[PDB]
Amino acid sequence: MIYSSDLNKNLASQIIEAGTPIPGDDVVSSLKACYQCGTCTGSCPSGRRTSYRTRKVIRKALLGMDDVLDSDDIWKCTTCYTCYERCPRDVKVTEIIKTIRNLAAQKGNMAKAHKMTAMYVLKYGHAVPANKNTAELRKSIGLSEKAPIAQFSEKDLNEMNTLIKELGFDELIGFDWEKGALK
Template sequence: MEVIELKNADSDFPDLVKKFGGLNLSACYQCGTCSSDCPVSTEFFYRVRRIMRRTALGLKDKVLPEKDIWCCTTCFTCFDRCPQEVNPTDVIVALRRISAREGYTPQASRNTSANITKLGHAVPSLEDIEKKREGIGLPARPPTAASHPEAIDEIQKIVKKRGIAEIIRFNWDKMELEE
């Protein structure tokens, strides 16, 4: 069994997590409802309860760099069933926000937000699909940001004001992610 040295813990960490949206973290009494309901936990050693405990103890180095927090599907099953209303999904999302600021975001998650910044959509429009749309009497591109460039400008204003490009390391000159 692993010995956890609390002298390595950061006692300010739980408050930081609360600031980023994990408001009810300290209500967790480790019953494990979250882990047993989790669709991911049956597939590999992923335990929501462990994430809650480590976070509450301030063991940020065992939480922020781990891929675990990016494996949550945000199904909200634990959120609905938690008897303490810890809202574990909110805690995990708060951890993602902190982890991203330390540069740990997986490439794919940065990509989705880069797409939204560039296109106003999470996925690009494809020529093949545009032809299929026309074939059934729909406009090649839907009446969304895909055919309204000014809508993309508006999204970029929000991205700039909120500093998202810096968090995901999006380069405005190249209009793509930095390595």
């Protein structure tokens, strides 16, 4: 039983506004053109091994089911862009899902491993930072012990911290600058 009181009439608009200006109004507003044909669900490789149905995400969005933001289903999309490529209504499906995830993240629906990966780029400027074995491995091959990346360049590392703070990404992931850990 789904009553009006359970639905959010602005959910669709909220997704569009979250998608403006990145990736853009015209891109995200494409969800409004979906005619629930199911080409996205049949194309989905994740749907072949889970309860995830790409078409229902768009449906829930258009109907106003906020629970979609709390669903684990949206995080099962690998972003292979196969649905995006085949949709006959030009729905920027993959892009819409990412934007939906942006709203989910703002609601506090983020995995720890994900927040950890985000923290390593904030702290060491990289998703997979170099370890003690990296230095030995790079040397043994015939490459610079330390690669010319932002990890070993404070200037670049600080530039990211400035941008992050301004963007509010630190607040989003719930990062405490003094402790250097998440909340």
